[PDB]
Amino acid sequence: GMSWQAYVDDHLLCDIEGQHLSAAAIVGHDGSVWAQSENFPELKPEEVAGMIKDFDEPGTLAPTGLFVGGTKYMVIQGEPGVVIRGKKGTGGITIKKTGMSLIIGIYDEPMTPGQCNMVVERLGDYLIEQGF
């Protein structure tokens, strides 16, 4: 049967157009990690709360910055209540909200934001349809 580690390893860290995410995780809304990749940062307190806040009231994170594992990302265009996106240098991050989790993918060049978006958001949609 399926496991959260399997979803990370086989559905987030998988090859897309010859490129792979640098790291990924699936985390409960309450910050409890369901599964994560080897290099995925440990989350600092209130990082997850920021994301939840930003999903609930769109725009709040932008003046502040997006923090993940003590790394700061410039907020870029997301989708209100559904996806948060950020840039840092030639890399970035996508965070997609499901009914009870957050799907997080982190990429760096030569991976494109579109590729990261695609992988994280498509798994998100699948998980949402399953009730998660």
Residue numbers in the entry: 0 to 131
What does the paper say about this structure?
A backbone alignment of the two 3D-structures reveals that they adopt the same conformation, with a root-mean-square-deviation (rmsd) of 0.27 Å. The electrostatic potential surfaces of both structures display the most significant differences that lead to a more electronegative surface on rZea m 12. From the immunological standpoint, it is relevant to note that mAb 2F5 only recognized rHev b 8, but not rZea m 12, even though the sequence identity is 79.4% and the folding is very similar (rmsd of 0.27 Å for Cα).
Here we isolated the monomeric and dimeric species of the recombinant profilin allergens rHev b 8 and rZea m 12 and obtained their crystallographic 3D structures.
